[PDB]
Amino acid sequence: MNQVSGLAGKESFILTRIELFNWGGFHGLHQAAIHQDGTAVIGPTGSGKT
Amino acid sequence: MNQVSGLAGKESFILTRIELFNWGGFHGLHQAAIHQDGTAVIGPTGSGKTTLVDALMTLLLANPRYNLASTGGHESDRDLISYVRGVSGPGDGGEGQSHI
Amino acid sequence: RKQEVPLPAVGVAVTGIPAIERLRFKEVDDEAEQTLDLSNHAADLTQIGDDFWDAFNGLDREVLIQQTLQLLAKENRPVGLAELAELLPPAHDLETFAVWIGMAREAGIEVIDSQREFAELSDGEGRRWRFNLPTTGLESQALMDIDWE
Amino acid sequence: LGAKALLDPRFRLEFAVSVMDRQSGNVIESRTGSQGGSGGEKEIIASYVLTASLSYALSPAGSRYPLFGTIILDEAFSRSSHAVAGRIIAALREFGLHAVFITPNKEMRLLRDHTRSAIVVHRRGQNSNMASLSWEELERHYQRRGNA
Amino acid sequence: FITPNKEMRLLRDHTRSAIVVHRRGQNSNMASLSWEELERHYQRRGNA
What we know:
This is part of a larger assembly, with four copies of chain A and one copy of chain C. By secondary structure, chain A is mainly beta.
């Protein structure tokens, strides 16, 4: 399933990481570990996902 | 959660039944009953649910804002004529897009 | 009012010329008897797709709260996420994990995500797995104080 | 729609889709079959159409890959079937687009199956806050000689 | 009550009973159910 994401990067600019600092409600520094094999972002109504 | 049954049944009339035939997205004779103490209706998105809600409202106004459950609060793609004839033009999409 | 008046006849259309050819007739000779139908149209009740039934089995966060609060009262100490994983290996696995993180963020006791701790967990049909988690302080008083509407 | 046709170049010409057989060029599908109610079936074809849009738009001329690799989806699959979303991800595999997905604390088993990490977010009042998580399949064994 | 596919869980948790409607071709059929009858039908689906 996830293989062509591992191949990706070597093929194209794929994304695995994110940081914030006082963006929206994200006070202080917050970070996100996106995986080289796809990732999810899960949160309830009005959590800061959007 | 479910146990506020007290006031119901006595003062007011309470909807527990439906009788149907050749209506809307349904076909042939159908029947059902609501639970006198609370009920829900479930099914796939696009499981004739909106049309079954219409089936009630048609008896309870001059003119309903048709198809309102699937079409929020405005004029809709479906009306009495379509439901009566069973028309489902926009739905099938690739069979005959009228499918009467 | 019904009295006639002397006015000219203009646009005087003749009409209805009584020609016998104009006669056609009822032809019930087409003696059809259309469909009577009253059958009770019940049918298979289960066919509907899978994700519907997945929602039919969706996790309940309140019972999860019961379990986790009992676990943290028993532990009577801060509990990291992997520790929770082995303490009560969930079947709705990353569901309980996301909810646990939401709890820790809702609960106030320190929450950290700068390290990788792991736990192996089996799903509803036993099929086993591994996970990668941060550490955080889950504790009885914290979650108990907070409500879980 | 008349004004849209006259002014809008896009409206000047309708757009269609068809499923071909690679081996002969034969046609198998040319139109939708479920398009009403609140459901949907088109999503498998439309997934590959959207992948075409993004892969081509991100790819240099004639490049097998889109040079930009990542795609995002807010609310991802909170409205799509499990199989439909899996096919979406697979279509993104066809061009290798590193896919990112969002959901309002839903779409559980699907995201487990097709991705390998998530970033959990929660809001305590005015403050939102993140965490990073992942799930790794057992190299030892899912469960020896059992269902996997 | 009416509901999309999701969030039925609370209805189970907070209602006496349920009717269900089918989609089957351009044809739909209904069923009057109790919650545990629905669970048993789902169990029958899982077993068969």
